[PDB]
Nucleic acid binder design. Structure first.
Lengths: 105, 85, 103, 209, 35
RNA sequence: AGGUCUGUGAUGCCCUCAGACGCCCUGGGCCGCACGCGCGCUACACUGGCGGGGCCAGCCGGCGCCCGCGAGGACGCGCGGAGCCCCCGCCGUGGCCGGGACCGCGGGCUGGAACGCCCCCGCGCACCAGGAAUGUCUUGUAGGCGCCCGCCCCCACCGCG
RNA sequence: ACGGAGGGGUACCACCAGACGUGGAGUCUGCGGCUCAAUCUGACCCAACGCGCGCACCUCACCAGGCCCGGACGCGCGGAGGACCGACAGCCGGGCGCGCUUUCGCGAUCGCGCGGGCGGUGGUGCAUGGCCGCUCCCAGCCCGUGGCGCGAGCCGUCUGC
């Protein structure tokens, strides 16, 4: 409900660098093992399912991503509108592209 | 209520610093990493559920499956289970 | 040199497992030997009610999953670290047939 | 002479990966509807994963400059927790789409969602199959097709098998669900190719001169 | 329904550059945050 | 118009939606008992019960040492299979050493938590082969004897074999 | 379709010949009734009644009580001269900054109204899909051309072995 900005930035960066996010359907207390952020917290701190789930709800509502639920897993993908939005929250300059376009093969 | 203390007699009798046995079930490492928060979900307990339809009843744990019997006949052919004999 | 290597291959269907066997035996005759051991078949069994609701005659399904396993540990010192690769890439790349190598 | 607690790792390292495949089947089916998705396969090469797809028109899923594919690869890896760039993918193309039930039934679902009547859609599907060289196709459309009191009317053309082991080789079946304003419209397809692949249907004898 | 009260001048613990409040941060004293 | 909207990110139309039919916590209940009946288990004994000994399976399969009458427990390593039956004795037609329900002291296990399950001493219910009525079965079959898995923190008179 | 009509066949979910049982008692479990704050519900000849895969917590729906919003997204208004959110002492309370006598904090992650969502083991299986059961431990079912009938229909698809 009260989400730190480090978390927002972390989620956005994870999206851009991976263009995706596959997330569990969970509502109890727990910590996501993937996306991590540092706020003087040990070496790194992991977030909580609640914050990230609220974030993702909002994003998909705005049209940034498109879900594709499955065996009780959330599969999100960022679109073009989303790219044209993530590119400015992170302060990215124009022309920059995410890694999957970087000829993985 | 940090300024709340108890007689020493009522302290050694307290449960030894041991991790409550109930560990829940993390079907995958992804689905976790260890006001109301004081009692949101303190009743830790096994919550084993189907990894398809999320129901807590009739779950084949044999062979590390974790699939409901109903949610099973459908996907059994894909998995490789077949009906012969 | 000599590393006592062992080959284990696993499959659920009996037709590729025997085809993979032949290719390997063909391609390992020189780099030492490669005679197989056929294991007892691990058969997974699941019995389920054929009904989602529990009505009518009590009728049961009988699924199973046979898993076949063969084991060529005959390389042994007869294969070096790179020599194992040679054949393993010269054998066909069947889509499904798990393989693991250990000394 | 042998311990049974050790090989359980090999046996349990096959089962997990068979399951991992099914989730992908479901996900693709819910995703690559427009690319003629049919099926999937996997190859657990230690260094990296390989997945082989069967699609009518891969260039759609390929994506300009391979963007959709790559967007997919990074995604799956997070879920199955593999290092991306070791989660590569390959796509293969189906040439006999009329022999594939999935393509047919998905096309039928599309055509139905455009309001066209069932009588035309089914028989167009069936003509398409026969042109492909098939010995039979049966279509079924059950549900609230009229005002109320749902009924099933089935269309067919040729000859079909219905029993025996041979039905697991020469008979290809599939189903879908179509959500509409009245309700749900169940649809299913089945096609019979006796001369498929190289196997020979039993009780079939050919003589000489 | 806590019975809070409203004050616009939340800035007069001091007179002029003073140290009234027991960096920064009857029954004795009860410090903000933890005890 | 057989059953399933209480298996599901299967669903049309209704009802609930900030004192919630959402979600989370603490307790209680689903087991309560003058009564009718459905599938099973244990017995009514000598073609037997008790004590001692000898010995062979299969789906498949884990063990040592030391405490404790036992159930169980502390440590440490990878290694491994039973009832009926057979032999020798006691009992001697007695609701008796057949049968083991009920109850009174006590010792332990699971678990955050016993109302749950195991062991020991004592007490020792109905029952003498079952009316009108009725079910299943043709070779390794009926019947008798036990052993594994499932669900499962603990527990099988059930179920698949 | 039916016949307390005829003629041919067939099967231990039928009989002959036999075997082993149930209905007799104690007990496990499920089913109706009584009771209770609740004793959550589906199924009722074959074709409901150890069946809807082991109920102290969860599972869980029902009974007595309490936290939280996890109110997406749009328009109007308000707000850092301070939106919303946490806490010591001391009580009330099963308990918890739940509430209370007070004053420290935190910082726009928003508040209110109007539209619109999400969710729900909530109803209808007599609105539906899918899956099962039964008819059926059956031996039967249909197409093209042709022929007979105004026609519904018949022959093919057999009153023989």
């Amino acid at each position: 409900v009260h989400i730190p900005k480090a978390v927002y930035k972390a989620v956005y960066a994870h999206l851009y660098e991976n263009a995706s996010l596959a997330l569990k359907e969970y509502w109890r207390v727990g910590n996501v093992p993937g996306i991590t952020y540092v706020d003087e917290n040990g070496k790194l701190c992991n977030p909580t399912y609640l914050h990230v789930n609220c974030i993702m709800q909002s994003l998909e509502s705005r049209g940034v991503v498109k879900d594709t639920f499955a065996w009780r897993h959330h599969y999100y993908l960022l679109t073009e509108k989303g790219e044209q939005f993530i590119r400015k929250e992170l302060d990215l300059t124009d022309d920059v592209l995410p890694t999957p376009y970087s000829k993985p093969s | 209520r940090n300024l709340g203390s108890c007689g020493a007699e009522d302290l050694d009798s307290r449960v030894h610093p041991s991790t409550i046995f109930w560990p829940t079930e993390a079907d995958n490492i992804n689905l976790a990493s260890g006001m109301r928060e004081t009692e949101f979900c303190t009743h830790i307990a096994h919550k084993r559920e189907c990894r398809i339809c999320g129901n807590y009843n009739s779950v084949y744990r044999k062979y590390g499956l974790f699939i409901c019997r109903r949610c099973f006949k459908e996907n059994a052919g894909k998995i490789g289970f077949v009906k012969l004999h | 040199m000599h590393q006592k290597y062992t080959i284990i291959v696993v499959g659920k269907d009996l037709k590729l497992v025997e085809r993979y066997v032949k290719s390997i035996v063909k391609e390992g005759r020189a780099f030492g030997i490669s005679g197989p051991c056929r294991a007892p078949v691990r058969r997974l069994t699941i019995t389920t009610r054929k009904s989602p609701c529990g009505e009518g005659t009590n009728t049961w399904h009988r699924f199973e999953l046979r898993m076949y396993k063969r084991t060529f540990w005959v390389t042994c010192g007869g294969n070096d670290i790179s020599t194992i690769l040679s054949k393993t890439v010269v054998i066909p790349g069947i889509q499904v047939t798990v393989e693991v190598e250990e000394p | 002479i042998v311990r049974r607690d050790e090989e359980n790792v090999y046996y349990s390292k096959y089962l997990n990966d068979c399951i991992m495949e099914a989730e992908l089947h479901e996900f693709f089916s819910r995703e690559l509807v427009d690319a003629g998705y049919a099926s999937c396969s996997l190859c657990r090469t230690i260094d990296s994963i390989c997945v082989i797809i069967q699609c009518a028109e891969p260039e759609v899923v390929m994506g300009d400059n391979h963007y959709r594919l790559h967007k997919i690869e990074y995604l799956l890896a997070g879920r199955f927790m593999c290092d991306p760039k070791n989660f590569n993918i390959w796509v293969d193309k189906i040439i006999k789409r009329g022999l594939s039930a999935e393509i047919m039934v998905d096309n039928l679902r599309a055509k139905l969602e455009e309001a066209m009547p069932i009588r035309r859609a089914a028989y167009s599907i069936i003509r398409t199959a026969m042109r492909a060289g098939a010995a039979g196709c049966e279509v079924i459309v059950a549900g609230k097709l009229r005002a109320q009191r749902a009924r099933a009317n089935k269309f067919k053309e040729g000859c079909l098998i219905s029993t025996g082991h041979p039905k697991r080789i020469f008979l290809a079946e599939a189903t879908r669900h179509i959500k509409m304003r009245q309700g749900v419209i169940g649809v299913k397809v089945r096609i019979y190719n006796p001369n498929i692949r190289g196997a020979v249907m039993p009780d079939k004898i050919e003589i000489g001169a | 329904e806590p019975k809070k009260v409203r004050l616009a001048c939340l800035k007069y613990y001091t007179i002029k550059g003073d140290t009234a409040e027991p960096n920064c941060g009857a029954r004795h004293a009860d410090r903000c945050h933890c005890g």
